[PDB]
Design a protein around this motif. Structure first.
Motif, PDB file in Angstrom:
ATOM      1  N   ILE A   1       0.708  -1.292  -0.028  1.00  0.00           N
ATOM      2  CA  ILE A   1      -0.276   0.043  -0.018  1.00  0.00           C
ATOM      3  C   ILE A   1       0.999   1.199  -0.001  1.00  0.00           C
ATOM      4  N   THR A   2       0.425   2.344  -0.728  1.00  0.00           N
ATOM      5  CA  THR A   2       1.118   3.476  -1.132  1.00  0.00           C
ATOM      6  C   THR A   2       0.346   4.710  -1.026  1.00  0.00           C
ATOM      7  N   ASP A   3       0.937   5.805  -1.301  1.00  0.00           N
ATOM      8  CA  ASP A   3       0.115   7.305  -1.317  1.00  0.00           C
ATOM      9  C   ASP A   3      -0.485   7.750   0.132  1.00  0.00           C
ATOM     10  N   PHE A   4       0.573   8.252   0.989  1.00  0.00           N
ATOM     11  CA  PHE A   4       0.110   8.438   2.223  1.00  0.00           C
ATOM     12  C   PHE A   4       0.182  10.018   2.466  1.00  0.00           C
ATOM     13  N   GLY A   5       0.184  10.578   1.313  1.00  0.00           N
ATOM     14  CA  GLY A   5       0.145  12.472   1.326  1.00  0.00           C
ATOM     15  C   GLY A   5      -1.199  12.849   1.668  1.00  0.00           C
ATOM     16  N   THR A   6      -2.203  11.978   1.731  1.00  0.00           N
ATOM     17  CA  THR A   6      -3.548  12.259   2.216  1.00  0.00           C
ATOM     18  C   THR A   6      -4.022  11.401   3.416  1.00  0.00           C
TER      19      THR A   6
END
Ligand SMILES: Nc1ncnc2c1ncn2[C@@H]1O[C@H](COP(=O)(O)OP(=O)(O)OP(=O)(O)O)[C@@H](O)[C@H]1O
Length: 280
Positions: free
Chosen positions: A146-151
């Motif tokens: 799992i990726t995309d932790f900016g949000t």
């Protein structure tokens, strides 16, 4: 401590609105990293720094086999660099598109890994808020990353107020109450399970507003053949009342969720070391 000179950059892995991910080999170790590169002038000017800082902060906290790992960060005059684990097999979405839908064994297995991932994440008090098949990558061995932790949001040791997410997976509480919680991720999980089996997520339209209206009305149907125990699980996750979703804290957490009959044959213990079923 690392510098751009420390790497040989190879092919571009992908591009975001304010970033480029490049495959790189560290000269000193011969290790492969996916390096995410952000232009400093561009993120400052387009007001993206909060998202960059959030991604680094959230990812630094994570240490679980089902998440992309942040190994290091450096910067020069023009750029920030995030050294990430390389997920060789790309997005889970690519596989849904290619094969059309997953069989029961594959649905069960990948859903279990996502449930395991979310149990870890919510245990650390973090909500993802943009969970979707594009943000679930696959490593060389076909385990999820799992990726995309900016949000993502670290909840302070229930609710978060930024409006973020992707229309198809956004929870009703974010639309109507303007906030999200751990249960919002369980709503997204319901959408993803449905998508694995059906081939498309349950709330679909060619524009966001139309999707929003369907979400708030719980307006969706199951395709004629849909694994009955999967359908039962989806019905327990796609619930308008966020306090009534299987796996949420008011439903007493991940124990009852993992105990759902759909997961009966699952060994939860060492999932990341089990051989994933072949997709096809
Ligand atoms: N660790 C990784 N390993 C392999 N591929 C990756 C990795 N991280 C990202 N990618 C690929 O590179 C693409 C770009 O990711 P990035 O986070 O820079 O932006 P994005 O999230 O795709 O787009 P945006 O930020 O505009 O929504 C991803 O969509 C994915 O296909």
């Amino acid at each position: 401590k690392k510098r751009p000179e420390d790497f040989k950059f190879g092919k571009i892995l992908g591009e975001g609105s304010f970033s480029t991910v490049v495959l790189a080999r560290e000269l000193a170790t011969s290790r492969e990293y996916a390096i995410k590169i952000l232009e400093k002038r561009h993120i400052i000017k387009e007001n993206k720094v909060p998202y960059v800082t959030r991604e680094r902060d959230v990812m630094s906290r994570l240490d679980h086999p089902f998440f992309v790992k942040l190994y290091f960060t450096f910067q020069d005059d023009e750029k920030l660099y995030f050294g990430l684990s390389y997920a060789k097999n790309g997005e889970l979405l690519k596989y849904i598109r290619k094969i059309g839908s997953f069989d029961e064994t594959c649905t069960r297995f990948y859903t279990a890994e996502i449930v395991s991932a979310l149990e870890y994440l919510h245990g650390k008090g973090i909500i993802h808020r943009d969970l979707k098949p594009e943000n679930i990558l696959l490593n060389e061995d076909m385990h999820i990353q799992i990726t995309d932790f900016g949000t993502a949001k670290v909840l302070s040791p229930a609710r978060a107020n930024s409006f973020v997410g992707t229309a198809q997976y956004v929870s009703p509480e974010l639309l109507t109450e303007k906030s999200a919680c751990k249960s919002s991720d369980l709503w997204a999980l319901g959408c993803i399970i449905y998508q694995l089996v059906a081939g498309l997520p349950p709330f679909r339209a060619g524009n966001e507003g139309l999707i929003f209206a369907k979400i708030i009305k719980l307006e969706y149907d199951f395709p004629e053949k849909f694994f009955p125990k999967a359908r039962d699980l989806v019905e327990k996750l796609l619930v308008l009342d966020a306090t009534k979703r299987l796996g949420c804290e008011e439903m007493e957490g991940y124990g009852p969720l993992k105990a759902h009959p759909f997961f009966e044959s699952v060994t939860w213990e060492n999932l990341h070391q089990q051989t994933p079923p072949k997709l096809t």
